[PDB]
Amino acid sequence: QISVRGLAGVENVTELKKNFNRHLHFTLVKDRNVATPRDYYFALAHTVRDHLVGRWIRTQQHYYEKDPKRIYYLSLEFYMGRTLQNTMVNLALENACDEATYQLGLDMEELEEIEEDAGLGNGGLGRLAACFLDSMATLGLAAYGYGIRYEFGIFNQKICGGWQMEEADDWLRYGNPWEKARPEFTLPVHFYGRVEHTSQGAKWVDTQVVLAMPYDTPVPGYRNNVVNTMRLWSAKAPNDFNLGYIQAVLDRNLAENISRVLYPNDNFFEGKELRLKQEYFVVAATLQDIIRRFKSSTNFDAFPDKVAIQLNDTHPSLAIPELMRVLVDLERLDWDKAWEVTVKTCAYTNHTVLPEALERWPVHLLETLLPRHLQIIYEINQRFLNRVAAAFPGDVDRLRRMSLVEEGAVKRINMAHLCIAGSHAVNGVARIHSEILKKTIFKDFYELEPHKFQNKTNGITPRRWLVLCNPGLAEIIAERIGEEYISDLDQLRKLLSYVDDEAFIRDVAKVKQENKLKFAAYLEREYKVHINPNSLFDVQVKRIHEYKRQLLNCLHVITLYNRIKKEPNKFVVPRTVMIGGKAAPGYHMAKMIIKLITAIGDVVNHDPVVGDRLRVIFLENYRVSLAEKVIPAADLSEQISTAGTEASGTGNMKFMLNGALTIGTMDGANVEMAEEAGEENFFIFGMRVEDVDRLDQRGYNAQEYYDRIPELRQIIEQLSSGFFSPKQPDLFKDIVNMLMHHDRFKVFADYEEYVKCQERVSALYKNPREWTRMVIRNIATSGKFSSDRTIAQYAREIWGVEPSRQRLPA
Amino acid sequence: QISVRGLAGVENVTELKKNFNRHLHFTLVKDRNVATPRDYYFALAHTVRDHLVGRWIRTQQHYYEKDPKRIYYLSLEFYMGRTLQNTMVNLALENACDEATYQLGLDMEELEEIEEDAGLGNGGLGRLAACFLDSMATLGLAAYGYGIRYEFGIFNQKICGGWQMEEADDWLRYGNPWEKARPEFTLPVHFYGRVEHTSQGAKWVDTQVVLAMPYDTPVPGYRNNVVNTMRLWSAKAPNDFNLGYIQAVLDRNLAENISRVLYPNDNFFEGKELRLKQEYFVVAATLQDIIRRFKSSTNFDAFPDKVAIQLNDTHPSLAIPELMRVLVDLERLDWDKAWEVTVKTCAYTNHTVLPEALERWPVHLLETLLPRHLQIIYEINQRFLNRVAAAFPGDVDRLRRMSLVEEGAVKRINMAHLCIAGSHAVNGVARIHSEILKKTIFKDFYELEPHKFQNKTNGITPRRWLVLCNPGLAEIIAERIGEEYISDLDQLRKLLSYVDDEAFIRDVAKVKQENKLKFAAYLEREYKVHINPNSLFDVQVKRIHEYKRQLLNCLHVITLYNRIKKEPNKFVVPRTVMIGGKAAPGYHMAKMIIKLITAIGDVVNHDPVVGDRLRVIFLENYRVSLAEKVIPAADLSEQISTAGTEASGTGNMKFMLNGALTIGTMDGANVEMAEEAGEENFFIFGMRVEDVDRLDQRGYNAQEYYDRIPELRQIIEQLSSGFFSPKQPDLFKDIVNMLMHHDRFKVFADYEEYVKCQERVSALYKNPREWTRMVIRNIATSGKFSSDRTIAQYAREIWGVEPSRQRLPA
């Protein structure tokens, strides 16, 4: 059908069809008379999977022959989403498969909607890992993703009575055709026990053993025949476990619960034992696998030359003391040499500066669960502080500030401090975030070892986030500059020479209109909700959190509503305000924010005077597959976190690449995006980081804004009086109280400028031609935000390996 | 290689090889350089499985088109064993596969040893179900096996320090290539709740829901292209289950524990709630499936004409009140009509008369778990007793004896009484057992409804128990009378005309010698134990239980030992005494019996004076795959249960078909076996049922035998004094005490005659020619014991369907 989707050759279509029927028969054991759409989806998935195996096997054989340096990306989250379409895109089988299923009398798009999302992540951090695996394979790096195969991923969100309800994400129910169990490579992981000091070295004994069973999933690069591996561990009890009889067998669940479910917290630390077990489980099994592969290439001096371990945040920070444990206790290396190897092998990536998100584990927990690791951590701390004391003689407070051990009610281990000490590189995820790390929370560490600190601005893969979700846009772009940009996004700059091209302007605007129509139809299909395709699509999708300020968006919405009710017969640009995202189960304020959003919709969407001029919809169960649908349909991207809180953000990049203009604060990557496109082509507003600091030094008093802004006051009074909750007048008392007395994120401080900026957005939307020209300038300068650029920088500046675009023989 | 194993055509071998490589590559994702024997086993299994699918699909389509009466065999146990070789035998692919793997450079026998046993059973009852499925498919019946897919089957037995140790049977660890999950057919099962009585009928509400997910396994008939289905249910929690957040997800295990593990009891009832849940779980899911299939053929009058439900013991007895519940509460039929349908649909098979094995569930358990079913049971009881009262006016004791409700400390429901009342047929499993049912425990029921009582003597499938495990014997037999006997075992009688044939006598004896050599080699291979292949193989394999009297065997062994020590330089026929079997985890006496056996071996096997004249080995982890190895190698089959206790026995039939002579009591099927072969060709001894009764009436006093039998006294003194347990002189005090004061099975009463009979066995073994001629007379008359004969009788006399030998188009 379309160019970028590959060729539909006669031979290939014929071969796909026969293999499709073969799997339906032999694999699914069904016939065309009893087969259901799900059956057809699986027949197609297995057919596509077959094309991966040959490449998968030779890629791994290749790495064996050449023995390049291996990159191990450790993460407790991999937000993969669906795999079928992505695989077809990277293998250039999309048009062929579409034609083949068409000839078999089936609609491939219908079949793609049957695949469950692999929701093994919470949000940005997990999605970044997913985009990174794609870029590493596309850049020909010998990389391996290592994580946990959760039986239940992020919960499915249902909205009942306007409230979020959670339900188990049983994503493996019908089976996962993409994974391959490798029980032959099962490894043991130890817990509890005690430390015994003998003649030669310490020994960790009397431990409880839990088996780690690996499952491998292929990660295809973009049309280069490279297929890397993502290995996820599953917990299994040994057969002699707890071995009345019946109970012992039933108690096997205790050990296997380790890989049962993903903790649903976004930017928030919960110090539960089960979570600590998951963190060690992934680290212990992974390191054994790494060392095994290394030995099958004694001389650990070359370990750093053949291995690179990237820690996605502090979640897998135990890799540092675990590596030391193995080298010292098992391999018998002296401490100093072991430490040298560890530091040169590990690298740490920080993703946030929010205090409540940093991991600080209670010493009593580590003491009971991992006694040997606690001893190693103390030793690491002791030697680290000796170095600090020698560099800053007499600075006793610096010593207490930099310690890995925090004193107080309960002693805790600061995992971030542990990561900085044991890594040769520490990076932030956006220029401003990395600068904040050096000026604030890690200032002491930066002064001790300035060379360790770097920046690696985040990115997104243009395969899934452009070609896959927006083929219409990828096509009109390819028509003008070719297909090369898909693996070299910087080429989009060439589109700048078409900003005055009347044909292109029309095509860009047409693609957007088509996406909006398709999404508007979807909302009625699966959610039965009417919306005006002609209105401006104002969307904010991301996890619900106070720092992301969905509340500021709500205030604007209510303002628009009050203004209409004030001057009913006055013209206003029609808007469809869409807000979506999940709230962590135990985050009360976040759940109240979702309720407020639906409550506003209940009032606004049923007011006759408003008509189709303003709609407020809450997008239920926001996840990767839904993002691929709503982002291509958006006109306005809301990125309004309080300056200094959103480390980078990645959703912002997805919107920019797909034709949406951005309204946001100078926070995270927004700064670099505005810098690339030009501030005149971005809708910036609000306090800058320096302004927030000034306000804090002076003291933030929300009452002041309430007293001086009539429109704001009216909104707060509506909330308090029950205007949005008739039957429950004080339903939103907590929200008002927080906004008025303890708003850590200064919602009111940016209200005026936000509303003003939004007016400028509406003014531009009234001029179709100029709105589209600004969109073109955004798309044309989004090249820097490709994860291929990010990974190439990690490769050269941290891992010490050269990326490759060379194809492998198919 | 051998005739009975089929042809190895050029086309077939070529096709098998290419498909083998295809699966190794595409299915296992491996190459010949990294593939392990397990990998090769799976490549072969998938290759063989492919040949099943076509036949499997058309067989089921066939039943849809013709709509014959369906047979549903409900059992909580299906002792299947391995599936690879059995599938090849029934599809006539054995020689072709052997040749193909040979050309690929692999030993197929080595690969077959890698497959885990499907140990979803405890012993005879479970194995019978397995043999029955094979015969039903071979006889072209539209039959379905329905059970539970236990995650853990019968435990693996390890022997440590002479004691049994149990370990989880994680048989699904590497995956099961034979099963096909059918999540699309998942059904809900209800538990707890309460009964609500409304205007029209009762309603079962406020129940907890557990999902039943089916897994289908193909059951191929013998070379007739018929492939039936065995559907096993797996427990799954609904996604809204218990829906802090984390705990709710983890608690899903509570519901899924229902299908976690098989209760390891043989001939013993344990009234645990979890077991009751398993029984209802299989019954509820199965009945919904049956009715669904029936409706997809309102007129429930024809239900009995299209459906037959066979209850394997009382384990699935809840099917009776569950069927009533559905017809009355859901379909709205009047009681009388519903009862008529139920009775004509259900049939019950009793497998034992031991009081401790009968199911008697506490009313308080049913009351809490299945409130509606308890009400229905009371109603059934009320109407049943009204019928008894009308037939035997004034006989109040009969009323209390026949009630389904037993009074006492705690009220219980007698499931056996429930089954007789709600079934149109009740059968025993051997002539003598069925007669005992009518004369004793079910005497009252027989007098009320004589027509319901039948006999269906058990049998074993000659495919697995002859062709598969003893190809050498199947071959020499086929050489003389053809291959027809494999599906018509009665033809073995033609072998009677070869009893004087010198060539045949030599071949029969040669096959046995080869089997013994092969097994002797196996014992050293996997268990490192030396044995003399020239000695007589005296084996007793079956679950450990006091009624099976492994203790009587031990007494004989010790007698042989003492006699040798008494007259060292006297000649005696060399013997290798092999005893094997698992003991239920909570059965103390059974565990002490295993310890005694090993202790005897410790003494006997290391006594220089004995030499290679006597060896005592305990066969560890006895299971189906081990039975297929030891039975073909046995010379003497020990079937020595106390007369009246072994309902039928089936191991006895396996030994008879494979060339072993039998020493046993006139119990169970032994009676019919001796009758078929002729008592002169059987080694019968001991009390007959009538003798046991006489002894009980008089009072069994073990002391009497101890006082009058010097040799017996010596043995008891050796046991008591610690002769077999030096470091622990009183280790076997419990055994001695039981034997002397409370032996329910009169071990001493049969001692003298047993020892005497054993001497007659040794005398015959000294004459090779005559021993073999007697063996030939046994093999030649074992035809009656084929499960094809048993099933044909069930079909005609109970289910009302005609068996068919006609092939289906392949």
Ligand SMILES: Nc1ccn([C@@H]2O[C@H](CO)[C@@H](O)[C@H](O)[C@H]2O)c(=O)n1
């Ligand atoms: N636990 C955490 C910490 C940070 N983050 C997020 O990670 C992404 C990727 O770097 C950032 O772009 C985002 O700004 C940050 O909040 C997250 O999703 N979860």
Ligand SMILES: Nc1ccn([C@@H]2O[C@H](CO)[C@@H](O)[C@H](O)[C@H]2O)c(=O)n1
């Ligand atoms: N729970 C029980 C009850 C009887 N049985 C057994 O069933 C078989 C098959 O009919 C009989 O041959 C055997 O005699 C009996 O003990 C058993 O294995 N388990």
Ligand SMILES: *Cc1c(COP(=O)(O)O)cnc(C)c1O
């Ligand atoms: C891209 C993405 C995110 C991250 O969005 P931000 O706005 O950067 O927080 C979160 N969830 C999903 C499903 C995503 O695709």
Ligand SMILES: *Cc1c(COP(=O)(O)O)cnc(C)c1O
């Ligand atoms: C045949 C068989 C049985 C039944 O044996 P009996 O001696 O009749 O009790 C038990 N276990 C296995 C593994 C069998 O194959």
